Each structure stands twice: as C-alpha cells, then as structure tokens.
Design a protein around this ligand. Structure first.
Ligand SMILES: O=[N+]([O-])c1cccc2cccnc12
Ligand code: NI
Ligand code: NI
Length: 330
C-alpha cells in the first residue's frame, strides 16, 4: 500500500555518521555480527559502500535519502526486517572485498544495493501462503512472488524525489544495473537455488565454468546472493542460535494465521511442533546450506571461512540432537 519517505531529520543525521575505529578492522571479516550495533546499522552500510565502490560513487545526499527510506519500508516483523537486510548487505561486502577484481564497478554497487533492498516490504508471509490462499500478489507475480514485489518496491524507492542514486550512470549503464539488481533479487527465491547450484557444480567439475560468459556470471552472482541471504548459518553459534529464534518466530505466526483460516501447516511453521526444529535444521543444512557454501568455495576460494563456519554450526545442531545443548537464554 504505497511507499514511505524518510524524514528530513533522519537522512541528515546519517550524513554525520563516522564508524568507530575498532569496527573498521572487524567489519572486514566474514563472521562479523552487526547485532550489537543497532544505531550504527545505516552508517555501517554507507561505510561499506565507500570502501568497495568509492566515496564519490553515489551523491551522498541521495544515498542517505535512499538508505533511510529503505529502512522505513521494512516492516516490524521478526525476521525479514531491516536487521536482515543489513546482515545480507555485509556478507556481500566481505565476499566483494575478498574477490574484488573479479567484479566490475557496476556489479559491485548494484549488488550491495540489491542486498539491502532484497526483502523490501516483506509481510512475514512465505510464497507458499500467498499462492495457496490466492493473494493478489500471487496472481500478479505467478512465480517468485515476494521477490518480484521486493524488486518492484526498490524501483519505487529509486523513483522518489531526490532518491535516485543511479541517475549519474549512462543510459546504457542504468539499464544494466537495474537488471543486475533484478536478477540478484529474483535469485534470492530459494526455489531457484537448487537448479542454480546443480548447474554451477556441474559447470565447475567439467571445467566449462567461465566468468567472461555472461550467463555464468549471472549464476555465480545468484549463488553469492543465496550465500549472503543465508549467512545467519555462518556466524558463531550463539549468534546462529539467536537468529533461528527470529526465523521460527515468523514461521509460527504464519502457521497461526493458517489455523484460523482452517488449514493445518507444515511442521516447520507449527508452534506446537518445536521438537522437530533440530532435525529440521540438520536437513536444511545438508539440503541447502552446506552445498551452497561448498560450490561457492570451489568457484571463489577466498570465501572458504563461510563453509567452515557452516560446518561448525551443523556440528552444533548435531550436538543438540544428541542432547548436548547449552542455556541460550533467549
Ligand atoms: O528452517 N529452515 O528450513 C529454513 C528455511 C528457510 C531459510 C532458512 C535460513 C536459515 C535457517 N533455516 C532456514
Ligand atoms: Ni526474500
Ligand atoms: Ni532474505
């Protein structure tokens, strides 16, 4: 229902922001956790943009207008919110800085912006819900429903008064960056990931993989988006554990909505089935997470610490199943 605009007071404050000395060396790491730095979140992203894309890549006035309005268009939901957006943006950064010369100036700016916009206006409902209960979004966007909406939300923010960070690019480059973003955002639909990963794995093993081949690039970028989107599983265990509480909180509230509409949900969305969570996580790690981080490491060897951390977190979920958990506090 429309689009929000940040207050003059909000974007003006962000211009003044300086990232504390200590964090500059910490932010660079794959395992870094934005969580203890809430007030600094918008300023963290600006920082990341300036290191990777240069301080004059975007008109700072417009950049600050963009970021704060992006913040205001995320919803007070338990998982697919502002915190998630900034977390994903940071994982992309770490990948980029670690693989810098493989990606053009145009792809770097667009990917960082795409990560921050990738869950715009998320309601805390899955694609499954919308398509089952024939929500208008499902009739408009028959596939990749929320994703198409996220991208459409991003373009709506760009189209705001003084919000268009991209204007300074040529008409040819403008076209390209909206397409980089669109593909990046659509690639966060996990339905697509399975095919994409299988395709990349096979390309890598047979050694036909070629980053000068556009279609191949699109795919590697796609897996990068998947890797960032799921980076909750690559942090240290305490952080990985707390984030799951948020992921499930939102799942169960959707399962709670389905019970009212007279349909019993999948175990994962059932707050009376919390006992299946550790086994569910094992399966999600073996089915999705591990393979995603394995293929990405093969293609981009500096991204390895993500795989190691994910293997560690999977070992922790295995510990949980054998009954070796620790307090967690919540
Ligand atoms: O629980 N899941 O199956 C599950 C579904 C979708 C995204 C996830 C991200 C991190 C951990 N688990 C996830
Ligand atoms: Ni999403
Ligand atoms: Ni996401």
């Amino acid at each position: 229902a429309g689009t929000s605009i940040c207050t003059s007071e909000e974007w003006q404050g962000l211009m003044q922001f300086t990232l504390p000395v200590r964090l500059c060396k910490e932010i660079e790491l794959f395992h870094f956790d934005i969580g203890p730095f809430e007030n600094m979140w918008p300023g963290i992203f600006v920082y990341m943009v300036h290191r990777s894309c240069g301080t004059s890549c975007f008109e700072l006035e417009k950049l600050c207008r963009f970021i704060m309005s992006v913040k205001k268009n995320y919803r007070r939901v338990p998982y697919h919110n502002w915190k998630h957006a900034v977390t994903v943006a940071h994982c992309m950064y770490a990948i980029l800085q670690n693989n810098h010369t493989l990606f053009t100036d145009l792809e770097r700016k667009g990917l960082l912006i795409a990560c921050l916009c990738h869950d715009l206006d998320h309601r805390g409902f899955s694609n499954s819900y919308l398509q089952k209960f024939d929500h208008p979004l499902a009739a408009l966007y028959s596939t990749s429903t929320m994703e198409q909406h996220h991208f459409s939300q991003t373009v709506s923010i760009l189209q705001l008064e003084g919000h268009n960070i991209f204007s300074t690019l040529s008409s040819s480059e403008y076209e390209q960056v909206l397409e980089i973003i669109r593909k990046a955002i659509i690639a966060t639909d996990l339905a697509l990931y399975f095919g994409n990963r299988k395709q990349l794995e096979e390309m890598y093993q047979t050694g036909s993989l070629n980053l000068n081949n556009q279609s191949h690039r699109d795919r590697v970028i796609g897996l990068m988006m998947t890797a960032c989107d799921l980076c909750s599983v690559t942090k240290l265990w305490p952080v990985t554990k707390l984030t799951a509480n948020d992921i499930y909180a939102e799942f169960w509230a959707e399962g709670d909505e389905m019970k009212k509409l007279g349909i019993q949900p999948i175990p994962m969305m059932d707050r009376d089935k919390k006992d299946e969570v550790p086994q569910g996580q094992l399966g999600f790690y073996n089915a999705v997470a591990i393979p995603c981080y394995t293929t990405l490491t093969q293609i981009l060897p500096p991204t390895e610490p993500l795989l190691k951390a994910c293997r560690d977190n999977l070992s922790q979920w295995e510990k949980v199943i054998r009954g070796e958990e620790t307090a967690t506090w919540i």
